[PDB]
Amino acid sequence: ALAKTGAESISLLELCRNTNRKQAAAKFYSFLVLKKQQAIELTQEEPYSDIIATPGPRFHGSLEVLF
């Protein structure tokens, strides 16, 4: 459990590479839910730019699944 390290940020557009529309939409919606739960912070530089997640102020489990 300790060896499941992660990154400083997650790119939504990178996560959605080689996904279909329904899968990509579900990942986008998951970012909204994680933000509501304060599990992540979100930044988007411009409309329709990449959306970048960084760790939020609340812990969250199963983040290796969600990413």
Complex with other proteins: residue 1 or 31, whichever CB lies closer: 31
Question: How many CB atoms are closer than 10 A to CB 50?
Answer: 13
Complex with other proteins: residue 7 or 32, whichever CB lies closer: 32
22 binds other proteins (CB under 8 A): yes
- For other proteins, the binding residues in 42-61 under the rule CB under 8 A are 42, 44, 47-48, 51
Q: Do 30 and 63 meet the contact criterion of CB atoms below 8 Å apart?
A: no
Phi, psi of 23 (to 5 degrees): -65, -40
Question: Binder to other proteins among 9, 11, 19, 54 (CB under 8 A)?
Answer: 19
Question: How many CB atoms are closer than 10 A to CB 9?
Answer: 13
